[PDB]
Amino acid sequence: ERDCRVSSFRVKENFDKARFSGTWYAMAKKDPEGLFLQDNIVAEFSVDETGQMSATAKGRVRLLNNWDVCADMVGTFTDTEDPAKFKMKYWGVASFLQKGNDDHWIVDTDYDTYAVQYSCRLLNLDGTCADSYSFVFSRDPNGLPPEAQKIVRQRQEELCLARQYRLIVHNGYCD
Ligand SMILES: O=C(c1cn(Cc2ccccc2)cn1)N1CCN(c2ccccc2Cl)CC1
Numbered sequence: 001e002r003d004c005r006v007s008s009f010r011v012k013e014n015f016d017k018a019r020f021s022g023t024w025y026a027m028a029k030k031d032p033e034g035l036f037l038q039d040n041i042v043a044e045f046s047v048d049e050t051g052q053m054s055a056t057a058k059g060r061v062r063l064l065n066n067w068d069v070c071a072d073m074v075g076t077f078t079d080t081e082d083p084a085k086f087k088m089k090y091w092g093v094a095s096f097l098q099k100g101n102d103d104h105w106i107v108d109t110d111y112d113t114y115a116v117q118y119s120c121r122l123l124n125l126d127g128t129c130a131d132s133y134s135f136v137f138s139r140d141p142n143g144l145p146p147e148a149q150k151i152v153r154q155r156q157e158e159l160c161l162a163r164q165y166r167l168i169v170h171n172g173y174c175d
Pocket of ligand 1: 036092101
């Protein structure tokens, strides 16, 4: 019944880079395959004079049960036809020689309480996503207001990721 094709997904109409800048706290996430930030995930977006968006993400990464590292990462975004859909060239500060490259879609946001982000790394033949990740961001790490809660839940379901998100802890672990 539900249309889960990635090309059918709506994103933030008239997305505004300047308003989106500043600190964002990831409170929930749906994982992709492979190694990935685990928790204490804080993103700091910013827009330079020329108007190109970039961001830094810090977070705990599990190497062993015995060993974690606070991985500082950096991202730089490239605009497309759609102002909510970017191409994020990203990397760890140590491994800056080595870089990854993802879709980065701002699915929805109100700029001052919540944001829903999404990325498809691989399509199935039917157009649905085979490997996706999604962050639920918040300006306040104590939670989202009632209207944000309703919207996030609605968007999570429309991305066909209902009940696939997991809550993320914030402990000042990477301060
Ligand atoms: O946890 C990961 C991650 C790490 N990897 C491994 C990796 C592959 C290729 C290069 C560096 C690291 C894959 N996904 N991500 C979550 C954070 N994301 C990111 C990075 C910088 C700014 C903003 C974001 Cl959302 C990058 C993707």
